[PDB]
């Protein structure tokens, strides 16, 4: 809550909202589909709590392939991934049970499982190698009361996209301990690195998955609150016994705004690839600028991101005595420099901070030297 | 689940969605404000979980008067009254506690308090006199574990608007047992009877109220999911100790669609009264038609509604032997006649059914004789 250096333009690197300085507005095809959808006035009344037939039908289509074959009925529409997790949890597990979380991971999985009456077990991401999961951790963090396994790919906060392999390896671990994999993939298709993109379910054969996702992150309409559970029952471990748990639960807050549901068929089919290409294009460059300069600075260890909208830097508490935690670090930083970074304590991973890359480059750059002026005095 | 008489056009009188046959579409000023709000693209990013400053500011203004003085800060925006109840409950009371419900009442208060881990006590509405509350019931249904009192006015399903007096009487009962009054007034200003309209909080002086409300019912955009808690702390029984409970809880599903929030300032200020006048005008006439004809029929006792969009009819199980409950009644009715009425068992009040009046008159009328052809054979 400390005030900035009133003598320097405040630079906020910590907030994930792409649309803050509006250099990432959404495609006018998105904006139109909503207006088109309003204009027909076909969508102002009640829908099923699970969402419109047609809307559900159409998102189901967008994410379909023989490997992970999707049908109208394995789709549920919810007002964001916040629900897509909220519900996805309530159905799999009850108070006094346990789920496998990332470290570092979205501070949300906690605020929920804890607030749902679930006790949390956190597995480990490996900075040394692309923040990939620790397989020892995982295999033997399992329980009797282990309901589930949560995988976030691409990652907030890591910036990471997993290899076509590591994914099969993670899928190897679930059939050896008989556990569900909420695959939080709200960041799906949000990659730019050399490496193409793999939705985790396309690579499954004996593993039950429930996939989150939605507009908020790709189409940069985060305040619009639409999202979907994609169910992926391979081997009838789930069956109708689980599907009803969602249909029943859904009826508590009754899903998303109907305009957004209306406009969904059209947002999916009418958005030009030149929209995405642009987005990820500008998310490589800014990531690379951020990466280079920060890696150039002595005392900080930026881990190159392959996707999503962040990267993690590691504070080498070897030449930084003044500060004794990343918490105090971002703190004197914010006060002295006016640069807002998020202390990675929040993601349950101290000695580190998260920097988003959606901020303009001319700003990434200006903010980058500030950070350097900070470390040629403290490392 | 029985099939209709395939030989008669099915008439659905039981579903509350005004926009089904689209004779109640919303004012094109409503539709515009959304498009205007989309068009500015000012509203696509994250808002406070409690909602936009400005949005919250502006709805606060619309509902302000010295008696019940409202400020920007006593407003929380939520994706409908479904949440406005969900949250309004979670904050006041914990598993193994008790709240005062109507009978008959919205089948929702149950699906929640029960599903929240709250045990439910139902007070009584008086058909003999305008479905007004039973004061004996109320005074002595209270407990140690009585958290709250829920009042629904106007009523779903009753069709009832309470007198300027009964309201003060209900407000007399709360300060004699020290209890909160979630005043579900999602139907606010939805009255047409002689009698003007009183929001319950304007008439309070030593009683804490939390008022639900939103677009769904007045502006006939039910699928749009916006709504508000209006807080009404008179006497600091609430204070900052309760307000935080909402602000904290809100952050679980993070409120409504931002387009809807954007468009809110304009929907409120730019909607012509000729929109409302029309709405309630057509809701008197159809109510009166429905009332007359049904009252004309022998064996049924329609209670005249003063507001909202329904009325209750009472099955005089005095000349209706064939059927032994309202459940079986609507049932043979639906099969033989093709008229969908809702058996008032659902609202926890048997021997009765609910008929909505939003369906076209030429349809109310046709459906009315069908009902008569049904009773000149069964009463």
From Swiss-Prot, chains A, B:
GO terms for biological process: 2-oxoglutarate metabolic process; biosynthetic process; glutamate metabolic process; L-phenylalanine catabolic process; response to dexamethasone; response to mercury ion; response to oxidative stress; tyrosine catabolic process. Belongs to the class-I pyridoxal-phosphate-dependent aminotransferase family. The modification N6-(pyridoxal phosphate)lysine is found at residue 217. One of its GO terms (molecular function) is amino acid binding. Its cofactor is pyridoxal 5'-phosphate. The chain holds residues 64 to 442 of 454 of the full protein. Pathway: Amino-acid degradation; L-phenylalanine degradation; acetoacetate and fumarate from L-phenylalanine: step 2/6. This is Tyrosine aminotransferase. Its EC number is 2.6.1.5. The keyword Transferase applies. Optimum pH is 7. The keyword Transferase applies. Keywords: Acetylation, Aminotransferase, Phenylalanine catabolism, Phosphoprotein, Pyridoxal phosphate, Transferase, Tyrosine catabolism. Disulfide bonds: none annotated. It catalyses: L-tyrosine + 2-oxoglutarate = 3-(4-hydroxyphenyl)pyruvate + L-glutamate. Homodimer. It is an enzyme of class 2 (transferase).
